[model samples]
Target: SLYNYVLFDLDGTLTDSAEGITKSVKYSLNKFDIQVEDLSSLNKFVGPPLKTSFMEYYNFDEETATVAIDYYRDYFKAKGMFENKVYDGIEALLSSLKDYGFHLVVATSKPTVFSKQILEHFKLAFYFDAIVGSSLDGKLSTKEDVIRYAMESLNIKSDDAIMIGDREYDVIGALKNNLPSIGVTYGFGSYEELKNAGANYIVNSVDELHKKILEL
Candidate 1:
């Protein structure tokens, strides 16, 4: 939680949208005739911007990564998005945190439209004060940008908020924006990645996350 504002990443940190995301990656790559039988390889794409992942993983140039992202969105919006589920203890954590009066917000690279859809579908939208995500035109897609947007939207200073997510992107973004971050390992990212990214704290489960927040 925040010292006041808790900025959370959507995919890996809150809900296990693993299947939805990896399947979307598979479908997008399939369009380019790049076949990956094991969807787990695409799991690295979960936290960062889609275009960047396409560029990094498949060696797509910037332009190509952009097009690939559209195809990724096609599958994600049609079916992949719904193939998601809330994490086991997230609802309880959010509920208790809300009761404690923390200002909770979703900070994600996902487009706001899709993020809201997924959060609402899982009944998690009710717990957040705001959902700050990328826009359709790809503006505000970076982890840093979304976190900044979330902070500005809440009209809070950097020290008033804390970041939470499953990947290095989350930690890096928080660092860039001068906020402390808590990296949670129960999702897609490994402990090394989070620690190397310089997270101020790391947690293993939603229960652990709750404890850390209250400890703050």
Candidate 2:
């Protein structure tokens, strides 16, 4: 069966944003007087919203996390998000899928505006039907919210849709929406995590992505 709608996560799935994300997270923590030994440990934060990272990793209470989030966005909007590098074959994969008449929508934990900016910066903005991301507020932003925002905004049905991402957040989000999801291993998440989340398909490369999706 062909899925009419495809939702993809931004950071790890579409772009390798290690440098930009690491710097931005450090920037935010520095501004908040928090220090981390290795930024690599915080790489997972790249795919999710800033406030969530602050609350989870920095151990900041919700209210304090919001302040750091504002600082993070200020630094990231101008620096972090722009430094993204699209995965080598992701553009080709997207082009091929588009040719196959699949409706592409970005469902990311980043803010909507930042998602749009990153896509536009990489010149991949035109490939998507719409872009969806987390809210700027202090609300608990989960992967479910990411997919829900995209589906609600585009009026798409979950049964005819699929989520493609590299993290547990992406898998769980798709699961909650009753959608099949393809897990990618090149991103931050591990194969074991995707397996635990019960991903519909697992892809090791972008070329493989096309084949896997077709088989699904």
Candidate 3:
């Protein structure tokens, strides 16, 4: 049950970025003439890579999706990422885990360069040993890719590290890396989605995360 290292997901798992991501998504949707009438309709961009969702969920053409991604990024870097707010008790949860001597790393789908800025801006950067996020150009930006890069950077074995995240993409990446994973419920993705995606553990509260991670 003890883990030598823990990898945390950034968006939704640790911080609530829905407002910022949603705002930028809707803005891009409208700017690209995608024809969305409500904020709810543009929410698919909240978690996944922008290009994938633009083409898959919104059904935009490749070039159009690229344009939409550009539009989303234009606002996201300046405004959307800043509009983010930390979840309640997160700072304490992190401090507690750090006090327990857990080596923490951040593995996220968001681009690593921006991830560094967001964490630094929020004062959470000091809590992590490493921060591995999506590539700036989608060259090696998949969940699996970032996770692998994190492991390589830290020189940790799959069994020595565990991934705690909120989405199926995270779980799939964990499975691919042969690591244990816990799905957090207090995020954009639902429990059903996490369970169905085959998460090894499901944590309903951040207060419970420390104990579960230590004892599981």
Give lDDT tens digits, candidate 3, residues 37-104. 67766655665677788888878887888788788889999999998988888889888888989889
Model 2, which residues run further than 4 Å from truth? 138-140
Q: What lDDT does each candidate get?
A: 0.91, 0.85, 0.85
Q: Candidate 1's residue-wise lDDT over 118-194, tens digit each?
A: 99998889899999899977867999999888888779788788899999999999999999999999999999999
Q: What TM-score would each prediction reach against the true structure?
A: 0.97, 0.94, 0.95
What is the Cα-based TM-score of model 1?
A: 0.97
User: Can you write out model 2's per-residue Cα lDDT over 1-216, one digit (the tens) per residue?
Assistant: 756898999989999998888888888888877787887978878666667677888789978988887777787889878777999999998999999899899988887777888899899999999988776773536789878877988989977899999988889889999899999999988899899989988988888888887777
Which lDDT value does model 3 have at 94? 82
Kindly give the number of clashing pairs for every candidate: 0, 0, 1
- Relative to the true structure, candidate 3 reaches a TM of 0.95
| Candidate 3 lDDT trough over 10 residues, lowest sum | 39-48
The number of the candidate with the highest TM-score is 1
The candidate scoring highest on lDDT is 1
